[PDB]
Structure formats: C-alpha cells, structure tokens
Amino acid sequence: SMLRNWSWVNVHNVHSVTGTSENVVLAGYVGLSRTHDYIMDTRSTPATSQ
C-alpha cells in the first residue's frame, strides 16, 4: 500500500509549492510584555473583537 502511493519516486522530482527552501529563526512571543501590562491594568485583555 506504500508503493501505490508513489513512495518509489525519485525524490528530486518533488518540488515545494514555492520552489524555495527556508531557514526561519524568528524572535518570538515570550509573554513578559502582556503579563506586565496586566499588572499595571493598562491593556489587560489583548485579544480583539476580530
């Protein structure tokens, strides 16, 4: 059942839908800004209506 799903193919003919690869290293959410704003009651809830 795995040969029938084209597991036999040359892996060099499989292209990403963008044609590119990617190495992402992004500074992310830590949560110190949101917890600080909650204690000061400035912006307690950050989730918007949308």
Binding site: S33, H36, D37, M40, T42
Partner: protein, 45 residues
C-alpha cells in the same frame, strides 16, 4: 507602549560627586618647587 512604575521626580535628588584618587601637593602647579632654594645663592634667614 509599556507603562512602568517609576520613582516620582520629587522623591529623589541628583547630587554631584567629585571623585579624586589623591590629594594634590602644596605647589601643584609648580614643576620645580625646589628652584626657589637652589637659586638662593646669597642665603635665607
């Protein structure tokens, strides 16, 4: 925007501090204070 509790400006005071590594000598601006003696060729009372 980050609102943070700070120290109110009226409950602290900036004070200027003068830091020195040593006490200057009496004849600080004199390169050779010993030339008043070395040039007393008549004597000193």
């Amino acid at each position: 925007i980050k609102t943070a509790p700070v120290v109110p400006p009226t409950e602290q005071r900036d004070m200027v501090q003068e830091e020195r590594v040593g006490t200057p000598v009496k004849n600080a601006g004199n390169a050779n204070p010993a030339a008043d003696s070395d040039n007393a060729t008549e004597g000193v009372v």
